[PDB]
Design a protein around this ligand. Structure first.
Ligand code: HEM
Ligand code: HEM
Ligand code: H4B
Ligand code: H4B
Ligand code: WT2
Ligand code: WT2
Ligand code: ZN
Lengths: 407, 411
């Protein structure tokens, strides 16, 4: 019930007590561990509200105060009366910072308390959503000096009036199945790209087309909007040694902005809550560029490098991987767009975990996600034992809207 | 109940039923996952069910389930248990059990090989000099002049827990570590404490960077005794690089035979506390972990210096760059000397085919993702993208406490 985590590189042991406040379930049992699985009423609502306000008032050191009691009373009356309730600005901000604080798959959480929260609860139309989103994009991008931000649309009501950004991130590239048999662009977006097209978009059918936003307000049929091109900061990818790298014609965008997730605060569900920070280099250079089912460029890069691709044991794949990742980091830095390498990010996270243990009694972490997808054991997180559990406020997965939507 | 795992690279979905046969626990609950935690005297009472379950599984695998022979065997084990309180395995059940422990070892990537295992039965062994002799034969058979063969040597089972056989070494072959007076370590930091025990027991330490440790062997609960493995039996590979001629001048070498000797084999409720086993190396074990962990030989700096990488900002990825070259070197050196080794691409690919085969024929393959994914280049290996289910089947290999912590010294 009081749990230890050991760092096997440093022998440092931390005691976790925060897990006892755990609410949601993991997917695991005593008979089976599902640690590597990607996706493992009035009555219900009041406990959730109470649990949240209790932690809020504790955080501002007013636990058991008249204002604590009165707010519980007030929210309680409101749920009874309206079957839902509204968060104060202060609670919304707290809730959102803590959803990030609790994100067990996020290595960058040392930043959790510096989050700019844009309250878009007064939004009513997809055009409004579009405007909020363009402002988020421009604020967060900040001409390359990126600032963490979230934009929070109105909460779910009877679930027939859901706000949703159909896009998986605010900024992503289109994917096109070809008569050729191959895929042009990003293969992960082939389906959403068709949805756009079938909804009206005229695709330029190139390798790196920024997708349009498909925005759904108030349970309505979603609508299309192009993000002003001038707001979408992109980086051409070059290598500081290989002159030929530029000729591959690779670019990526500066702003990683997950937009398909659900923010749960005090039992309330915010189904449109796009958020952004800044990239860790591996996300682009290892995953986006090298996954076989993504841009899958390893083979082309290896050839340009003239490596021995005869035998897997020459480690040509591994050699090409390093160079691609040097090139990503170098290009972002050269253009002064915020980026972090996996060494510095993981080092930060270890420090953040120390802080959270010391200050909060723990830090839920998902080792499978936290360890970078290259050079695992030469980053300190590899050697760090982690306990994974689910705390609220949280970011949660939700089904893609096109399987739900009734048109 | 059916459980599905999906591969996110291929969309291949597999269905696991084998997890239903699992009884032992994971460390996880519905409220906490302990999947990254390294480590999360038996009555007749508990022994017969364990025996029965094992023999049911044995008799099924030989298509003799419910046969007269199956039944006579259950009766014979049962009478042996509550009469002598324990029981002896037939040679065939011992072989079957040691293979299955391997088959079931969820942190093992090399398990496509599980049915090709040479089982050496050392249960007639009685003394530490006897153990030394068995261990030498294992080393020599397994080494096979570089053409490595998987083997396990199985010493007598636990009885009262006061007469345990134990190999005090953590692997049969490993290099000494020496903590220096200035605080630096010579040799391998992982083996400092053990190297200190050896010295205390009377080993004369060469005190270099790669001194093969002596075997410290406990027979029948007796104080352990030292022995030197004949040097001619210890195959070693000097590490050089195909293109960097200064690489040899780092003075690096490693041994060819990875032979875990501190684990406990459980078969049918019986506990075999000395059961050293060996296969062959995946290159990353040496080139990533043994050479480049900060707590081990820690050669990244000296290698990157020689390569003259930009070392002032980690975002040059100088570490990653040196890491690849070192791993190239390890594989190149083993191949050149004709000593068996597998690269992490080849091994993870084979594992994936192993795993799908196991899902089809067996109903599952328990696998620990944290351990299966290699410690470099994780996501360009197919395992990274493979969902896995981790659960515990018997027969199995288990951890046990280091014997210097529990041993009652005779003097
Ligand atoms: C400040 C810079 C940040 C860094 C360097 C960072 C780092 C990361 C990385 C590397 C991932 C894994 C991405 C993947 O494999 O797809 C991740 C996941 C995540 N981060 Fe962050 N993060 C940052 C900011 C944020 C912000 C601002 C939030 C929310 C306010 C957040 C919430 C999350 C969540 C919820 C996930 C899991 C998403 C999923 O399951 O796909 N992070 N973080
Ligand atoms: C034939 C070639 C083999 C290969 C390439 C191989 C590969 C590996 C690797 C790379 C590890 C992880 C080692 C570490 O991080 O310390 C491992 C773990 C393991 N393998 Fe194998 N293996 C092989 C044979 C065997 C054999 C013969 C057995 C026993 C009969 C075995 C049982 C295990 C066990 C129990 C572990 C977990 C070790 C631990 O928890 O410390 N493997 N395997
Ligand atoms: C099957 C496995 O859970 C899946 O590949 C995970 C592994 N670790 C990951 N880690 C991160 N950060 N992001 C991912 O998408 C994944 N994919
Ligand atoms: C804390 C963490 O569980 C620990 O570092 C594990 C990670 N994965 C591993 N994987 C393998 N094969 N071997 C190991 O020693 C480890 N160490
Ligand atoms: N830095 C972050 C968090 O905000 N990334 C979130 C997901 C982005 C994805 N990993 C990608 O490579 O596009
Ligand atoms: N290939 C195997 C199993 O036979 N490895 C066992 C552990 C070897 C350890 N990783 C080492 O580097 O010494
Ligand atoms: Zn688990």
């Amino acid at each position: 019930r009081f749990l230890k985590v050991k760092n096997w590189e440093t022998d440092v042991v931390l005691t976790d007590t925060l897990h006892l406040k755990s609410t949601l379930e993991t997917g695991c049992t005593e008979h089976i561990c599902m640690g590597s699985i990607m996706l493992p009423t009035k009555d219900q609502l009041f406990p959730l509200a109470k649990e949240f306000l209790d932690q809020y008032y504790s955080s501002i050191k007013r636990f058991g105060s008249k204002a604590h009691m009165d707010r519980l009373e007030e929210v309680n009356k409101e749920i009874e009366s309206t079957s839902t309730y509204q968060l104060k600005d202060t609670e919304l901000i707290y809730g959102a910072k803590h959803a990030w604080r609790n994100a067990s798959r996020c290595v960058g959480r040392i930043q959790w308390s510096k989050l700019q929260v844009f309250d878009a609860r007064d939004c009513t139309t997809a055009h409004g959503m579009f405007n909020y989103i363009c402002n988020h994009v421009k604020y967060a991008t900040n001409k390359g000096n990126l600032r963490s931000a979230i934009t929070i649309f109105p909460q779910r009501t009877d679930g027939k009036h859901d706000f949703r950004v159909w896009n998986s991130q605010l900024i992503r590239y289109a994917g096109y199945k070809q008569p050729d048999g191959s895929t042009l662009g990003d293969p992960a977006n082939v389906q959403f790209t068709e949805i756009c097209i079938q909804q009206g978009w005229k695709a330029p059918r190139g390798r790196f087309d920024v997708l349009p936003l498909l925005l759904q307000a108030n349970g309505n049929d979603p609508e299309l909007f192009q993000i002003p091109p001038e707001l979408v900061l992109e980086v051409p990818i070059r290598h500081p040694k290989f002159d030929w790298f530029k000729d591959l014609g690779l670019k990526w965008y500066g702003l990683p902005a997950v937009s398909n997730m659900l923010l749960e605060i005090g039992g309330l569900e915010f189904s449109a809550c796009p958020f952004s920070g800044w990239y860790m280099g591996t996300e682009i250079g290892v995953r986006d560029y090298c996954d076989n089912s993504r841009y899958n460029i390893l083979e082309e890069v290896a050839k340009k490098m003239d490596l021995d691709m005869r035998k897997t044991s020459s480690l040509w794949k591994d050699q090409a991987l390093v160079e691609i990742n040097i090139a990503v980091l170098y290009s972002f830095q050269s253009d002064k767009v915020t980026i972090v390498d996996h060494h510095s990010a993981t080092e930060s996270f270890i420090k953040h975990m120390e802080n959270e243990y010391r200050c909060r009694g723990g830090c839920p972490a998902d080792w499978v996600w936290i360890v970078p997808p290259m050079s695992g054991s030469i980053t300190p997180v590899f050697h760090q034992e982690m306990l994974n559990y689910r705390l609220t406020p949280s970011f949660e997965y939700q089904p893609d809207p096109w399987n739900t939507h009734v048109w």
